[PDB]
Design a protein around this ligand. Structure first.
Ligand SMILES: CCCCCCCCCCCCCCCCCC(=O)OC[C@H](COP(=O)([O-])OCC(O)COP(=O)([O-])OC[C@@H](COC(=O)CCCCCCCCCCCCCCCCC)OC(=O)CCCCCCCCCCCCCCCCC)OC(=O)CCCCCCCCCCCCCCCCC
Ligand SMILES: CCCCCCCCCCCCCCCCCC(=O)OC[C@H](COP(=O)([O-])OCC(O)COP(=O)([O-])OC[C@@H](COC(=O)CCCCCCCCCCCCCCCCC)OC(=O)CCCCCCCCCCCCCCCCC)OC(=O)CCCCCCCCCCCCCCCCC
Ligand code: HEA
Ligand code: HEA
Ligand SMILES: CCCCCCCCCCCCCCCC(=O)O[C@H](COC(=O)CCCCCCC[C@@H](C)CCCCCCCCC)COP(=O)(O)O[C@H]1[C@H](O)[C@H](O)[C@@H](O)[C@@H](O)[C@@H]1O
Ligand SMILES: CCCCCCCC/C=C\CCCCCCCC(=O)OC[C@H](COP(=O)(O)OCCN)OC(=O)CCCCCCCCCCCCCCC
Ligand SMILES: CCCCCCCC/C=C\CCCCCCCC(=O)OC[C@H](COP(=O)(O)OCCN)OC(=O)CCCCCCCCCCCCCCC
Ligand SMILES: CC(C)=CCC/C(C)=C/CC/C(C)=C/CC/C(C)=C/CC/C(C)=C/CC/C(C)=C/CC/C(C)=C/CC1=C(C)C(=O)c2ccccc2C1=O
Ligand code: HEC
Ligand code: HEC
Ligand SMILES: [Ca+2]
Ligand SMILES: [Cu+2]
Ligand SMILES: [Cu+2]
Ligand SMILES: [Cu+2]
Ligand SMILES: [Cu+2]
Lengths: 551, 55, 285, 223, 74, 54, 139
């Protein structure tokens, strides 16, 4: 009989990690660092949101001034969108994409570390605007043209914001280049492009979207910096400067939201088959839906601009409905995947269903927003706030947590606790709905977004109180997750097998937990989209080839 | 090359020393700065024992 | 009927009425779609779970081609219906009939408004006033800004009360001194962005209301971030009957403030739907 | 001219009434009163770009201007009539004096600048930090009229040097000194920002010792 | 004294510092931060920063001492 | 030493890299206690990690 | 790599249609005529996808089938040496710090800091590019 340890080594010795952190080219460690730093930035942005909600609880100005609340919503939106979501996308990519295609590494392993450090330092540069006496940027995360001039908002927080965004964008572009090259020309011998998982497809197309979007934002930010430090007149209102900035920024910004939407669609498309005990429904249909969404995401931007009166409404309205269709195809494919399975609702599956419900209501609100006549009433109100919070929280929070609970055993070799997982999920779900289901009603009555203060005659008091209660529930819900991760990194139940979820796919469940350096001591013969499942249950292969087609 | 291409201590701009006037950027050479730095940060702790002062 | 609007105030203009009808129908359709999809989700989550008596993995089916074709066709027709209604309503809402009864030169400057009464031409031939003031305009060569005689300046301690008649076709021309502001009157169920240079940026700064069914007081707010006091920029619209409106305009022709003429026409002099904001930065100041 | 006052009033009502109250009476917790400040004060605060301010913080920073020369002059005339205070000096042609404000005594100007001005700026007007988020800005970008109106109507935490405390000739000499300091070259090489031993130590550590250590690494061996 | 499994080249140089010195130094530094609260300053945000840093230093010291007490750190 | 040297220069640092001078003084006061400890910890761990690399 | 070039060709076609349709639909029916902002971005998005896909198609036409692109292939087909991958490096963090120094200089507009940041960027990029080519010190 074999010799083992009564419990695996909780932590390494002194000097086990810091040099690796400084000099790693391992995509797994880079993904880990991405996830940790992104969650820390998420904590900072959520603290900003908590301050905002506490101010908005009561109709006066109890502790924040106007300027501070403006800075709070600006930097909170910026931190949540750009210093947490896109980097967490690249973190998940770094964690599991080389594994999913049977590859030993990323294509340009030093460029990967460069992208991570550009992320970290650009995010810190943009946040450092708080140390300035004037405070950080206070013109929203959208940063419209005349208000971002040197005259309006003359402080240095705006400049630090612009340049930190530029550095983070360079890091993001380099990461996208790395991921596309890795996907294109480092796969395993059996891994044809129509055999890679949905996550790999989504990361590839997301990196293409990054390459399209982020350079335009970099150009616009360089133009704005030239305007502010040189008196350029690039965005002067006397030219088309106002609408020029709006066009450039939204041509960035809607591709950005689909950049942060597609990979988590891929993550849930990975997770559903594992806990449904059946293949992903419509594999090629899902690929075509992803491709259509990415294509349509580039030519829809000006639906963020219906209120200016300066854009062609029919073109962007029709394009927005047309881009809404493939996401519905995706939900019907996910329903088909769950359909007629053996569902065991372990924590990643629970967060995937939370994703389904949340992003469903968010998509309904979005197609409401697509219509220019309705957007005329509801734009720049909390109906928009509730809409994009529902979609961003279904996608970048629920699916991020599902991915973490899924791939934590694979990356660490230890299992997070299920009871804490259920507690944290239910806390997050209840808190989210409590704090965001009434902002629809708030915005429809006439409370505009980005207001630091209202009046008791406005009627905005009860719903703001309910939203602040829900925001504090969401803040409280982060204690179980942080505790779970902190305890289970070291004292979590060990994983000594491949595939701690049993019915996994996508070739990362055909290697140890954690995988070794260079990711693979063997590769199985790849014949289908789910090689690990047919490696662990060979008697099913025939059945998978006989029952695959309902019609 | 440095003595040619970099200006150090241009004392005509500073002017002669008069005890009644001072400039904003009063700093010693770098090797002494820590001394002045230690004077900036120490938090104004003084003692007055029996009719005397320890500044 | 009253709860499906999700907070949408009943409009005071016919365009707002049609927009609210469209919103309620769209909410009905979206709730129907959401009910279907949530029903599928909860049907699969409640039943279809794992049970003690299954040892064989399910049917490994991952393709139902006719169902995929049907479920791809259906969203296209749904969005087609929504697009048709959307285009009809939107063309109904941006019309700009070339003969408004009243023209208001809405000027939005940083954290207040200015209403001008550029031109008033009643259809029935009962009142006429040409407030267009080109002398001060050329003296202010910001030439894009429109100046009028009977202005209504709001101050950090006074909320401007836009006085309009009832049932007369009104027009708003929106211009901004420095930055983008937001013209929103939640009762109009419509808003627009007040841009600095509308013509250079190719913007429709002019929008028209066919008529206002109700005589009353309505709050208006800025709905584009403009700086620190973006929440401190409220205004009010008081829709009075045309006779009281003509009396107010006559009292304005003689040198008098807005409050003086409003009290002269038997109205409260200040804003009643919104009190002014304390210029104090807060409570611990 | 009264049309000057009319256009100045129109400019003030669409750009300054908020934070200033439409009658130059201060708006509480938003800004001060503007009665008695003077056309010189208005000229400084607008031509330097500081006004209009966009928010309240430790210091109102310098910005690009928001009004042309004649618009600044009209706003100044309006505030002067509604107020009563100092005015911008003007030359024979009736324009704001620019070249007729520079004196001929630069040693007197230097002594006055070091006693009165160099306390908060540098020896050469490079700027110095103040108590809590405030600072004395750079004097490099300031025409003689801007310096004159600055020292004559104390902008913000800058003490007001009245026409008796600093007579116009002494103000002219200080203006001359500031202009000469801004426009003069450096004789010993690239002036390291004119801030003294801090940039000099930085240049030593990053250009001198880096070069020395690189040369030693080239000459010597490793391990 | 220390072994070469934790510090590989412990035979080549001074590689162990007594835990008591770091514990006492942390507590003394927290005390210094606390002492800096009394002074000639009128602001109080810096007071919150001083209290927070003293709290985190004391928390780290107490955590380390407790874990070494129970043998979780050997 | 570096912290004291840059604290000496906090006026120019606050003028160029816009920061409150009081904020720089308080950062220096907290730092001249916190930063040495952080640097000790990081340097000790880094040296042991270099040994492990060898 | 037929499928990669096919994806980029499909994207190029759709983007060309979007750009041309937008240009025609705003030349007429838009206030200022051609929008001149969305049209440029869409045209050069077509250019981006066209460059990538056309290069991939030149690669794929002269390329014999790889194991990755050939269904029903064995793992043993992929045996041999893969290329070179850097085991470790501390140059990326220095490159990022140099770019951050230059970005801070440009944010606050300190020309000396911009110059120093660019010098650091050049030095650190030299270190990264030269890392695996420096030969033994010749003594
Ligand atoms: C999907 C699956 C993946 C998802 C996972 C993410 C989940 C999201 C939720 C996140 C919530 C929980 C977060 C983590 C909870 C605890 C984790 C855990 O228990 O496992 C420990 C686990 C055990 O480590 P080990 O490999 O077994 O051996 C380490 C030994 O214990 C000894 O190691 P050592 O002696 O070599 O020292 C290493 C460590 C030593 O530090 C500590 O051990 C504790 C002090 C740090 C905590 C205080 C916060 C700061 O770090 C330091 O030295 C930094 C000094 C203190 C920081 C001060 C500022 C630095 C300047 O550590 C990991 O493996 C994590 C991998 C890397 C994660 C850290 C990423 C942050 C760093 C990013 C770049 C920064 C480095 C550059 C310096 C700064 C540049 C400006
Ligand atoms: C925005 C600006 C973008 C920055 C440049 C981004 C380049 C991204 C290319 C990615 C594709 C190839 C690649 O991955 O390079 C390998 C490598 C990635 O590391 P890996 O994962 O270990 O893969 C190793 C390869 O297998 C081993 O690959 P390899 O060593 O055999 O050949 C790679 C080749 C790469 O070939 C190229 O792509 C050349 C294109 C670089 C053009 C530089 C113009 C910069 C435009 C200024 C923007 C304004 O590099 C070279 O052989 C010579 C490169 C010469 C230095 C390039 C940077 C010039 C310094 C810029 C200073 C600014 C001037 C004043 C302003 O990246 C580099 O070697 C260069 C990256 C430097 C980034 C600079 C950040 C600032
Ligand atoms: C990534 C997407 C994302 C996420 C996850 C969030 C998270 C949250 N957001 Fe935000 N939000 C945006 C995207 C997002 N937001 C965008 C794009 C804007 C626009 C900004 C702009 O207008 O410019 C915005 C702005 C915005 C508004 C609009 C305000 C206004 O316009 O007036 C509101 C309204 O309530 C809001 C609330 C919240 C709340 C309660 C959460 C909660 O879900 C957060 C829950 C997490 C926490 C509460 C953390 C708990 C904190 C602790 C446990 C303390 C410990 C921390 C440390 C020790 C460091 N945020
Ligand atoms: C995760 C990121 C994300 C995603 C995926 C989306 C997806 C969509 N969004 Fe939006 N959106 C944002 C992030 C996102 N959005 C952000 C951050 C803002 C505010 C930015 C700011 O101002 O700061 C915003 C604001 C925004 C605007 C700008 C309006 C305004 O500013 O007032 C519009 C306009 O059309 C819009 C609509 C849509 C539509 C139609 C979809 C569609 O893709 C949704 C499609 C999904 C469904 C429709 C549900 C599933 C479909 C079915 C089940 C089929 C049946 C459905 C039908 C038959 C219709 N959202
Ligand atoms: C070794 C290279 C040095 C050159 C050596 C060759 C020298 C030979 C002759 C010298 C020629 C210079 C003429 C003397 C004239 C002169 O000195 O040139 C300055 C020009 O401008 C600048 O400085 C910007 C220059 C940009 C490059 C500077 C290079 C800096 C290097 C040395 C960086 C080292 C520091 C490292 C940083 C560390 C990084 C972090 C670790 C003054 O500009 P000026 O037009 O007078 O305006 C002033 C305004 O600073 C002011 O804001 C205001 O406008 C005015 O008041 C005036 O003072
Ligand atoms: C609410 C709770 C808040 C908690 C607050 C404070 C924490 C309390 C504990 C804080 C501990 C306070 C008492 C203490 O420090 O004594 C013990 C150490 C380690 O000894 P140990 O017996 O092996 O610890 C393992 C058992 N774990 O120090 C010593 O023994 C003395 C060693 C002699 C060193 C000489 C001192 C030199 C001074 C250097 C100054 C720089
Ligand atoms: C940032 C955007 C960069 C644009 C590149 C353009 C560079 C070439 C532009 C040529 C300048 C010119 O010819 O313009 C004439 C004016 C005289 O104007 P004046 O005095 O009023 O009148 C005449 C009285 N003598 O010089 C100027 O503004 C000087 C401006 C020069 C800008 C230098 C750009 C530095 C590069 C920044 C690197 C950023 C890196 C980011 C790091 C993450
Ligand atoms: C003590 C403290 C809080 C300092 C904060 C100041 C600061 C770094 C503000 C930037 C915002 C922050 C904190 C960003 C953090 C994100 C990151 C990782 C940034 C990395 C880039 C960094 C740290 C840049 C700053 C580097 C720095 C502080 C250098 C010292 C600055 C000094 C005093 C330089 C000396 C110097 C001065 C002052 C000149 O005027 C001059 C003029 C002409 C030629 C040369 C010089 C010269 O060398
Ligand atoms: C709120 C943000 C304001 C706006 C809008 C305007 N001003 Fe103002 N004013 C404000 C502050 C916070 C201060 C003190 C800070 C400072 O830099 O002085 C001032 C002061 C002035 C002054 C100088 C007062 C003096 O004693 O001389 C002037 C001449 C002045 N303000 C004029 C002015 C003009 C012309 C404006 C419209 C362009 C204007 N202010 C707008 C606050 C605010
Ligand atoms: C207190 C410190 C002083 C003293 C004693 C002097 N200056 Fe000034 N200065 C100071 C501040 C805080 C400001 C900013 C004012 C504001 O933002 O409203 C200024 C401004 C100036 C300017 C204008 C700067 C520009 O053009 O961008 C000039 C030209 C100026 N100060 C010159 C000057 C002179 C000549 C002095 C001696 C008589 C002097 N200052 C003293 C701070 C302070
Ligand atoms: Ca409040
Ligand atoms: Cu969009
Ligand atoms: Cu808007
Ligand atoms: Cu506004
Ligand atoms: Cu506003």
């Amino acid at each position: 009989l074999e010799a083992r340890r009564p419990f695996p080594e909780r932590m390494g010795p002194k000097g086990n990690l810091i040099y690796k952190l400084i000099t790693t080219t391992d995509h797994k460690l880079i993904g880990i660092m991405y996830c940790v730093v992104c969650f820390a930035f998420f904590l900072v942005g959520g603290l900003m949101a908590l301050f905002m909600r506490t101010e908005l609880a009561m109709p006066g100005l109890q502790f924040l001034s106007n300027e501070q609340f403006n800075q709070l919503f600006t930097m909170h939106g910026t931190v949540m969108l750009l210093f947490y979501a896109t980097p967490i996308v690249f973190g998940f990519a770094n964690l599991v994409l080389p594994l999913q295609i049977g590859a030993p590494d990323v294509a340009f392993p030093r460029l990967n570390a460069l992208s991570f450090w550009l992320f970290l330092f650009g995010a810190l540069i943009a946040i450092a605007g708080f140390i300035t006496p004037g405070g950080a940027a206070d013109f929203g995360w959208t940063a419209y043209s005349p208000l971002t001039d040197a005259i309006h908002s003359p402080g240095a927080g705006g400049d630090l914001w612009i340049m930190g965004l530029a550095v983070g964008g360079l890091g993001t572009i380099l990461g996208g280049v790395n991921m596309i090259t890795t996907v294109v020309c480092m796969r395993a011998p059996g891994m044809t492009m129509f055999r890679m998982p949905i996550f790999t497809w989504n990361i590839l197309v997301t990196s293409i979207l990054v390459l399209i979007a982020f350079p335009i934002l970099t150009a616009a930010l360089f133009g704005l910096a030239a305007d502010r430090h040189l008196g350029a007149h690039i965005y002067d209102p006397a030219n088309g400067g106002v609408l020029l900035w709006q066009h450039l920024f939204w041509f960035f910004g809607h591709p950005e939201v689909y950049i942060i939407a597609l990979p988590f669609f891929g993550i849930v498309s990975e997770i559903f088959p594992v806990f449904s005990r059946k293949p992903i429904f419509g594999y090629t249909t899902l690929i075509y839906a992803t491709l259509a969404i990415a294509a349509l995401s580039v030519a829809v931007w000006a639906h963020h601009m219906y209120a200016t009166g300066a854009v062609l409404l029919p073109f962007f309205s029709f394009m927005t409905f047309l881009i809404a269709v493939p996401t519905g195809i995706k939900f019907f494919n996910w329903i088909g995947t769950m359909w007629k399975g053996q569902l065991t609702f372990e924590t990643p599956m629970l967060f995937s269903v939370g994703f389904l419900i949340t992003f469903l209501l968010g998509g309904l609100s979005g197609v409401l927003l697509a219509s220019p006549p309705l957007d005329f009433h509801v734009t720049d109100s909390y109906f928009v706030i509730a809409h994009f919070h529902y979609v961003l929280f279904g996608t970048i929070v629920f699916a991020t947590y599902a991915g973490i609970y899924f791939w934590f055993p694979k990356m660490t070799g230890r299992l997070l606790d299920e009871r804490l997982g259920k507690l944290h999920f239910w806390l997050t779900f209840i808190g989210f709905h409590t704090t965001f289901l009434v902002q629809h009603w708030l915005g429809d009555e006439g409370m505009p977004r980005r207001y630091a203060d209202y009046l008791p005659t406005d009627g905005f008091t009860t719903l703001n109180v309910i939203s602040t209660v829900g925001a504090f529930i969401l803040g409280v819900s982060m204690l179980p997750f942080v505790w779970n991760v902190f305890k289970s990194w070291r004292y979590g139940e060990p994983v000594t097998v491949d595939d701690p979820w049993g019915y996994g796919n996508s070739l990362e469940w055909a290697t140890s937990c954690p995988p070794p350096r260079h990711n693979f001591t063997e590769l199985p013969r790849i014949r289908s989209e789910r090689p690990a499942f047919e490696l662990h249950y060979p008697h099913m292969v025939e059945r998978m080839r006989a029952e695959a087609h309902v019609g | 090359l440095m003595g040619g291409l970099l200006t150090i201590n241009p004392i005509w701009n500073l002017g002669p020393y008069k005890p009644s006037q001072v400039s904003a950027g009063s700093q010693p050479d770098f090797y002494m700065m820590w001394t002045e730095g230690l004077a900036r940060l120490w938090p104004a702790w003084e003692f007055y024992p029996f009719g005397h002062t320890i500044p | 009927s009253d709860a499906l609007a999700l907070g949408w105030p009943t409009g005071i203009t016919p365009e707002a009425k049609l927009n609210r009808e469209l919103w309620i129908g769209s909410v009905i359709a979206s709730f129907a779609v959401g009910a279907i999809v949530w029903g599928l989700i909860f049907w699969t989550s409640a039943f279809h779970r794992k049970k003690a008596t299954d040892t064989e993995l399910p049917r490994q089916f991952g393709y139902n081609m006719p169902l995929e074709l049907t479920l791809t066709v259906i969203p296209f027709l749904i969005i087609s219906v929504l697009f048709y209604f959307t285009v009809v309503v939107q063309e109904r809402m941006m019309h700009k009939d070339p003969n408004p009864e009243v023209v208001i030169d809405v000027t939005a400057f940083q954290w207040n408004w200015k209403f001008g009464y550029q031109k008033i031409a009643f259809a029935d031939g009962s009142f006429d006033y040409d407030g267009a003031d080109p002398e001060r305009k050329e003296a202010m060569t910001r030439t894009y800004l429109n100046f009028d005689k009977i202005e209504t300046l709001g101050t950090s301690s006074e909320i401007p009360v836009l006085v309009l008649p009832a049932g007369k076709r009104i027009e708003f021309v929106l211009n901004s001194a420095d930055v983008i502001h937001g013209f929103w009157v939640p009762e109009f169920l419509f808003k627009r962005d007040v841009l600095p240079e509308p013509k250079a940026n190719n913007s429709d700064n002019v929008f028209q209301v066919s008529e206002i069914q109700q005589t009353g007081a309505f709050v208006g707010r800025c709905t584009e971030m403009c700086g620190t006091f973006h929440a401190m920029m409220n205004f009010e619209v008081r829709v009075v009957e045309p006779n009281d409106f003509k009396a107010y305009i006559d009292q304005r022709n003689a040198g008098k403030t807005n409050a003086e003429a409003l009290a002269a026409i038997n109205q409260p002099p200040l804003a009643i739907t919104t009190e002014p904001f304390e210029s104090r930065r807060g409570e611990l100041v | 001219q009264s049309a000057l006052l009319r256009t100045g009033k129109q400019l003030f009502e669409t750009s300054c009434v908020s934070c200033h109250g439409a009658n130059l009476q201060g708006v509480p917790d938003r800004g001060p009163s503007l009665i008695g400040t003077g056309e010189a004060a208005v000229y400084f605060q607008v031509s330097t770009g500081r006004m209009p301010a966009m928010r309240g913080e430790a210091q109102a920073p310098s910005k690009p201007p928001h009004f042309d020369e004649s618009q600044i002059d009209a706003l100044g005339a309006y505030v002067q009539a509604n107020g009563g205070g100092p005015t911008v000096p003007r030359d024979d042609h009736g324009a704001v004096a620019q070249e007729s404000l520079i004196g001929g005594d630069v040693a007197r100007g230097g002594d006055l600048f070091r006693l009165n001005c160099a306390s908060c700026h540098n020896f050469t007007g490079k700027g110095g930090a103040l108590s809590s988020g405030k600072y004395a800005p750079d004097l490099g970008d300031a025409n003689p009229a801007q310096i004159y109106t600055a020292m004559l109507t104390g902008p913000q935490n800058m003490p007001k040097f009245s026409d008796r405390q600093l007579t116009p000739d002494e103000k002219r000499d200080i203006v001359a000194y500031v202009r000469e300091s801004a426009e003069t070259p450096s004789y010993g090489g690239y002036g390291l920002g004119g801030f003294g031993p801090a940039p000099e130590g930085m240049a030593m550590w990053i250009i001198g010792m880096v070069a020395a250590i690189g040369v030693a690494m080239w000459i010597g061996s490793r391990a | 004294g220390v072994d070469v499994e934790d510090v590989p080249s412990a035979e080549w140089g001074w590689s162990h510092m007594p835990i008591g010195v770091m514990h006492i130094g942390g507590l003394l530094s927290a005390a210094f931060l606390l002492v800096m609260m009394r002074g000639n300053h009128v602001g109080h945000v810096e007071d919150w920063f001083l209290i927070g840093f003293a709290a985190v230093i004391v928390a780290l010291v107490g955590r380390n001492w407790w874990l070494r007490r129970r043998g979780w750190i050997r | 030493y570096l912290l004291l040297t840059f604290a000496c220069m906090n006026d120019i640092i606050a003028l160029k890299f816009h920061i409150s001078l009081n904020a720089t003084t308080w950062i220096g006061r907290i730092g001249m206690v916190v930063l040495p400890a952080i640097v000790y910890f990081v340097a000790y761990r880094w040296a042991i990690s270099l040994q492990r690399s060898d | 790599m037929h499928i990669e070039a096919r994806l980029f060709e499909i994207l190029t076609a759709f983007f060309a249609l979007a750009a041309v349709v937008y240009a025609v639909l705003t030349a007429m029916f838009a206030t200022g005529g051609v929008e001149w902002a969305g049209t440029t971005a869409l045209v050069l998005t077509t250019g981006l996808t066209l460059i990538t896909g056309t290069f991939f198609r030149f690669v794929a036409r002269r390329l014999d089938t790889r194991p990755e692109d050939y269904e029903d292939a064995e793992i043993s087909d992929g045996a041999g040496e893969l290329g070179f991958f850097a085991p470790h490096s501390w140059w990326p963090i220095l490159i990022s710090l140099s770019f951050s120094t230059a970005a801070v200089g440009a944010a606050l507009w300190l020309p000396w800091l911009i110059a120093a940041g660019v010098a650091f960027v050049i030095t650190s990029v030299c270190g990264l590019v030269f890392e695996y080519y420096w030969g033994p010190e010749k003594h």
